[PDB]
Write a protein that binds this ligand. Structure first.
Ligand code: NA
Lengths: 218, 211, 213, 212
């Protein structure tokens, strides 16, 4: 099946530049138009622009045509987004999409395939890796991990290298008064499984290249 | 730029209910209108294109109608997995534009939270800070009240909350309340408790620990 | 008893929107279906009777339709005064029954609050208690953060919030945060302040007084 | 115009009984059917029952027939609701209504709140909230039980700018609320501001002058 994976996201300073990539698999990339859509945190969807197979038609949302530049490498089956003079209002999740559903005489499509997105944070603040602390358990028991004082978002949390998925809740991060983020990841398990089963939370923070594997014990 | 306007912007409906969302375009776009579903923490997914055509794999409970300026998206029988933000999108003129979104929540029976308290780890105390965590697991409705008591003295301003989005399987919420104290302020007191008030609880539930 | 089911239970819409609410009866009630509006803190008020008939003095933007088991209530263009809970009621067989209600809320633009601080009264202090009140007047959206500060340092005391329902004229909210202290504790500090962070405020607003001034 | 005014609401111990009254004006009461409807706090409307002009027909919702007895007095233009052996699930605002058309309730009173609880009645303490273009002032209505309190300003002459907050249940099990009004700051020295507090359950009436 069609696969779209974006990279290049992270922290950039205001007025700064960044280049996003969207690696693709499962289709002849050379024969399709490609698009970029963005979503500011907790806000709506914004179409950035599109590029045809030839790169002879490159259309943009007018308010963004001055700082964004779309391009592709057909031999590498990769789509690009060059972002310049970035403002705080450009902080968003950036998605590459694959337009199709033509069969029309006119320039019309629906975006039938989207990638999972890459978050771009525009801030003058510095990167900081998290401190990971266990939330030790006391029928059903709850245990967790406290991922504290990191910048910027996101952090990814998995349990037992993806083996434990049910009863997992990874809370949205809250911005603390220090200017740094903090979150918790919890899981509910049988109280009988505590002193027998091993529980390890896997914390990843790509902006600071931090990888923590924390064993949670009662 | 054609302006897409959705109504309602938010709604709560029950499993089995027929749900109708409208979309209005600032000018005639014929049938160049698409509907997308964005499930919590995920990327949008195409549901309908050309006003009424279901994309491959989309359930038959979803349908679309309309023409020119006025459009409708219908869920014939609402299911817990339908919790999402729904977006209309015009594909008539450049730039392509989206509606502001319709946030759809599921109304279900009252479910009391399961409450758990967590003391600060020894490791964190070595840094000179203490974080006390109170977890309210799988409740409904979203409204819940967490009161921190430090030696039976009510606290304010020194805690932060975080609520998950509605669960796509059981339609519930989970909430985390974190009380941040300096190691000096934490070493001063013995009883730490979080008192929980919710529709599902006949009497406020308190979870406590002694330092 | 006939069970009445309303859909949605809750919705948010903007001023000028066409809003539609459905009602479903467990059995055929012919056209014996009525619609009531209950404004915040007020008694219900009849709008539509006999499925589609407007009651005397009811604005033209309200309409009703359907027969048998399925019924519709419409607001052709939403107004701020339409903030309320809408109930359907069957009048076919005894006992007369109502739907569970649809709470209708209004989405509008950001409005920053006006912030006020009130010290405890001399009458209150004479009784051994001191209540300090912080008022956030006419703001939107509902989300706000009030922080009590005593002698410029954060205060971790007993503070309770109360929020009004959306105003019928401007669709805004007002909030009160009350800090309760014993007279003895109230006298341990001189400057009392509440700090407000809202979407409509670029930087936080602080209102303060000096105990004895 | 048609006026329906309920009274008698307040604190009822579990298993206790109470009589509600609905005095009417502006219509020939003896020619109409009359009804009671109740609403539990933050919940839907529930039809209790109806009485015809000569009291030969008294209909109730089947599940509430043991808790209520409806009667009327045509000479006094008054509707009655006898409440028997009340449970905590009977806590609600009781409205008298006037049915019309031939099956709709075209007129409703403001309601009377009945609290079924083991606690005791306490009248509030009333305190001024004083100021120092726009000015705010108010009244703090503290430590009362049960609900509700009603607040008016200048005996009802001052309505614009008024915000009476919902009551909060304090740690003591007693309620507290505040009522506030925003006025032009140039009128602080000019006009007198008086809040009128009425706590019907304890029959407390307080008028506080609010001055800066
Ligand atoms: Na009963």
């Amino acid at each position: 099946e069609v696969q779209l994976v974006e990279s290049g996201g992270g922290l950039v300073q205001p007025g700064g530049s960044l280049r996003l990539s969207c690696a693709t698999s499962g289709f002849d990339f050379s024969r399709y138009w490609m698009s970029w859509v963005r979503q500011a945190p907790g806000k709506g969807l914004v179409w950035i622009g599109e590029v045809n197979p030839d790169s002879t038609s490159i259309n943009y949302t007018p308010s963004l045509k001055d700082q964004f530049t779309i391009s592709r490498d057909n031999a590498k089956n990769t789509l690009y987004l060059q972002m310049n003079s970035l403002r705080a209002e450009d902080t968003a999740v950036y998605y590459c999409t694959r337009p199709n559903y033509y069969g029309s005489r006119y320039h019309y499509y629906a975006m039938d395939y989207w990638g999972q997105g890459t978050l771009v944070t525009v801030s003058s603040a510095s990167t900081k890796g998290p401190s990971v602390f266990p939330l030790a358990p006391s029928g059903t028991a709850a245990l967790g991990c406290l991922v504290k004082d990191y910048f910027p978002e996101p952090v990814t949390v998995s349990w037992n290298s993806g083996a434990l998925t049910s009863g997992v809740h990874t809370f949205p991060a809250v911005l603390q008064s220090s200017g740094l983020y903090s979150l918790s990841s919890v899981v509910t398990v049988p109280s009988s499984s505590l002193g027998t089963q091993t529980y390890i939370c896997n914390v990843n923070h790509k902006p600071s290249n931090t990888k923590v594997d924390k064993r949670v014990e009662p | 730029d054609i302006q897409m306007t959705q109504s309602p912007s938010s709604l709560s409906a029950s499993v089995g209910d027929r749900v109708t969302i409208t979309c209005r375009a600032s000018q005639d776009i014929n049938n160049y209108l698409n509907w997308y579903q964005q499930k919590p923490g995920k990327a949008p997914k195409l549901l309908i294109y050309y006003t009424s055509r279901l994309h491959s794999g989309v359930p038959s409970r979803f349908s679309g109608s309309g023409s020119g300026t006025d459009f409708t998206f219908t869920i014939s029988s609402l299911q817990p997995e339908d919790i999402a933000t729904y977006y209309c999108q015009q594909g008539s003129t450049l730039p392509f534009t989206f509606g502001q979104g319709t946030k759809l929540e599921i109304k279900r029976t009252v479910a009391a939270p399961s409450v758990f308290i967590f003391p600060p780890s020894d490791e964190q105390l070595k840094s000179g800070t203490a974080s006390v965590v109170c977890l309210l697991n799988n409740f409904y409705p979203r409204e819940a009240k967490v009161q921190w008591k430090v030696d039976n003295a009510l606290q304010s301003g020194n805690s932060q909350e975080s609520v998950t989005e509605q669960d796509s399987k059981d339609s519930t919420y989970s909430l985390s309340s974190t009380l941040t104290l300096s190691k000096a302020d934490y070493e001063k007191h013995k009883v730490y408790a979080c008192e929980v008030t919710h529709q599902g609880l006949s009497s406020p539930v308190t979870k406590s620990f002694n330092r």
